[PDB]
């Protein structure tokens, strides 16, 4: 798929607001994912002992991981579709080392959209949400193709 320039602008405008607090957004998004889809927590041997939201919020390791996730995603979105080299190592680690099905990438996409709508309602109306949803669908479609090339297809 291809996004128009106007669509990328909507995506990068709200992302610039996210980047004012990467750690905070990273925590919010992972916690949302784990709350909504507790089965995803089982993939993380470093976090699956965490029992409550309070414990998640207090976890420094969880916060650090949130920053890593959003820094990587930000680097991909800023390529505006030209992301083939960025996606190769991400695909390999999520396919071979961790085995993360595509369904779980949909779950985190939902979590990102929820947190952006909650923190940035003025910059995340219907048109901006649509554009962010297209950008994340593009990401998932390209990662799924790489999964298949790698032998997983998740
Ligand atoms: C927007 C989607 C995602 C991005 C940008 C992302 C990015 C990353 C990055 C950059 C790392 C660290 C280095 C590496 O191993 O590649 C990582 C590790 C990992 N990711 Fe993801 N990830 C995404 C989604 C997910 C999902 C949906 C799950 C599981 C439900 C997941 C599970 C893991 C695990 C288990 C690790 C290793 C954690 C550890 O070091 O103990 N990832 N991810």
Curated annotation (Swiss-Prot):
Record-listed Phosphoserine modification sites: 4
InterPro entries for the chain: Globin, Globin-like_sf, Myoglobin
Documented EC number(s): 1.7.-.-, 1.11.1.-
Keyword 4Fe-4S: no
Any one Gene Ontology molecular-function term assigned to this protein's record: oxygen binding
Keywords per UniProt: Cytoplasm, Heme, Iron, Metal-binding, Muscle protein, Oxidoreductase, Oxygen transport, Phosphoprotein, Transport
Sites of Phosphothreonine modification: 68
Effect of residue 122 to A: In metmyoglobin
Keyword Heme: yes
Gene3D superfamilies: 6.10.140.2100, 6.10.140.2110
Family to which the UniProt record says this protein belongs: Belongs to the globin family.
Name of the protein described by the UniProt record: Myoglobin
Organism, scientific name: Physeter macrocephalus
């Amino acid at each position: 798929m291809v996004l128009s320039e106007g669509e990328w602008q909507l995506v990068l405008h709200v992302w610039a607001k996210v980047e004012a607090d990467v750690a905070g957004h990273g925590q919010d998004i992972l916690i949302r994912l784990f709350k909504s889809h507790p089965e995803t927590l089982e993939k993380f041997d470093r976090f699956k002992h965490l029992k409550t939201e309070a414990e998640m919020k207090a976890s420094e390791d969880l916060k650090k991981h949130g920053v890593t996730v959003l820094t990587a995603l930000g680097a991909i979105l800023k390529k505006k579709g030209h992301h083939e080299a960025e996606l190769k190592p991400l695909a390999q680690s999520h396919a071979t080392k961790q085995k993360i099905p595509i369904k779980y990438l949909e779950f985190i996409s939902e979590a990102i959209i929820h947190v952006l709508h909650s923190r940035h309602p003025g910059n995340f109306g219907a048109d901006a949400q649509g554009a962010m949803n297209k950008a994340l669908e593009l990401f998932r479609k390209d990662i799924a193709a790489k999964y298949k090339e790698l032998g997983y297809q998740g």
